[PDB]
Ligand binder design. Structure first.
Ligand SMILES: O=C(O)[C@H]1/C(=C/CO)O[C@@H]2CC(=O)N21
Ligand SMILES: O=C(O)[C@H]1/C(=C/CO)O[C@@H]2CC(=O)N21
Length: 420
């Protein structure tokens, strides 16, 4: 079990040796911090990416020593110590060819090793934040509850809704009304904001349903999700919710697109007040009228709107049911198409000797953070873990590393907390 010096050394060596998009980006970003040029920056970041002052300010906090290195597909974290025992984390999010989309250097997110479920609760609780932790073992005759805090509370879940979109898509594939190799076309009206990369493709770009669904899940791609939602039709997405495991489908009718949440939530305040006072009919009418190219930009987001219904609300039971249903859908799909999409990005470094398969999905919106996993061992025993936070102020929640890291610690301690 690695001592401090051992683990820091192992992290430093791993970072140097990481021959991958994350390795390349993490080494370059560390270079900015430890060294003593606008062209070289332009080339490392996404084309649509002040930074000189940002880097000066970061550099002033050093010198830095690498203490941990956590690459996970297109996301990565490097834990750094600066003088006098102060720690920071460098977070990286990459696009599909390894360009940097997000790069931040922030005070360390501290998550202790978990021994008990009470450790989880006492760590997570923040005044002003509603949270929920739900962990179950799935069995032939129902779920065994390992731990529950407020699983009955319906809460906003952001991109967790893409799990329902996935089930709706699979239901249509099974019916033969859509095919995995059918072509979807990106138009100006179908473009959404990140998370995701598909928005960066040119107008007219032709992409298969398979590759669109893959990015929808694996990259939480908002534009990919909206392409699927457009192809299926809102009625098909909605008509599905009851089957795919939702307790009060009226909470997600009309079933919003990401474009609609962004545009309604952070655009015209009058149009947003109209939503609030309208019934289901008036809301559908309002959405039809709002259809077109987005006006809202990433810079406009901030204020919370989930409390107005402009998000996707479900309880913890709903999340378990949709994941269990996807496990069932995957098994029925003998081609392995569903399984490949679901397992591409497990959100953490996974012990593959323990877990045969891991599904993962995150959701985030101002004032909203959630992470969920389905983990199935090699004997076939499945566990589901659902973590949720909502608040009236985004600063109370933060960038989501806290809640993700709590999940990481639970999964690390699975023998104590899940499978005991
Ligand atoms: O896919 C992930 O891991 C992303 C995400 C996506 C939801 O928009 O939300 C959480 C915060 C973050 O960086 N995670
Ligand atoms: O393994 C862990 O404990 C946590 C972590 C913590 C950052 O210090 O970083 C990676 C991402 C995550 O949730 N893991």
């Amino acid at each position: 079990v690695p001592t401090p010096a051992e683990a820091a050394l192992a992290a430093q060596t791993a970072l140097a040796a990481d021959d991958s998009p994350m390795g390349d980006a993490a080494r370059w970003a560390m270079g900015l911090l430890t060294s003593s040029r606008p062209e070289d920056v332009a080339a490392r970041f996404i084309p649509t990416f002040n930074f000189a002052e940002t880097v000066r300010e970061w550099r002033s906090k050093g010198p830095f020593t690498v203490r941990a290195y956590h690459p996970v597909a297109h996301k990565g974290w490097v834990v750094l110590s600066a003088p006098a025992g102060v720690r920071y984390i460098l977070s990286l999010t990459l696009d599909s060819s390894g360009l940097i989309r997000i790069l931040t250097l922030k005070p360390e997110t501290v998550i202790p090793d978990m021994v008990t479920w009470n450790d989880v609760e006492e760590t997570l609780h923040t005044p002003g934040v509603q949270h929920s932790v739900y962990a179950v073992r799935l069995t032939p005759d129902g779920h065994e509850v390992l731990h529950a805090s407020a699983p009955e509370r319906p809460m906003p879940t952001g991109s967790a809704y893409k799990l329902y979109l996935m089930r709706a898509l699979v239901a249509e594939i099974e019916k033969g009304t859509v095919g995995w190799d059918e072509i979807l076309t990106l138009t100006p009206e179908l473009r959404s904001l990140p998370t995701g990369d598909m928005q960066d493709l040119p107008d007219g770009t032709r992409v298969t349903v398979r590759e669109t669904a893959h990015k929808m899940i694996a990259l939480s791609d908002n534009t990919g999700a909206d392409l699927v939602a457009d192809r299926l039709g809102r009625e098909v997405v909605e008509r599905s919710l009851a089957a795919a495991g939702h307790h009060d489908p009226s909470l997600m009718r009309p079933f919003l697109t990401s474009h609609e949440v962004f545009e309604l939530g952070w655009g015209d305040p009058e149009r947003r007040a109209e939503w609030v006072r309208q019934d289901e009919a008036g809301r559908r009418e309002l959405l039809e009228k709002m259809a077109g190219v987005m006006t809202v930009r990433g810079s406009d987001l901030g204020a919370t709107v989930h409390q107005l219904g402009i998000d996707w609300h479900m309880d913890a039971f709903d999340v378990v049911r949709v994941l269990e249903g996807l496990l069932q859908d995957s098994g029925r799909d003998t081609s392995g198409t569903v399984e490949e999409i679901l397992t591409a990005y497990p959100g953490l470094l996974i012990d593959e000797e323990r877990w045969r398969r891991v599904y993962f999905k995150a959701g985030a919106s101002p004032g909203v953070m959630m992470f969920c996993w389905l983990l199935q061992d090699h004997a076939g025993i499945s566990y589901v873990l659902v973590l949720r936070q909502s608040a009236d102020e985004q600063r109370l929640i933060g960038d989501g590393l806290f809640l993700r890291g709590i999940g990481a610690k639970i999964i690390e301690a699975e023998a104590k907390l899940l499978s005991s």
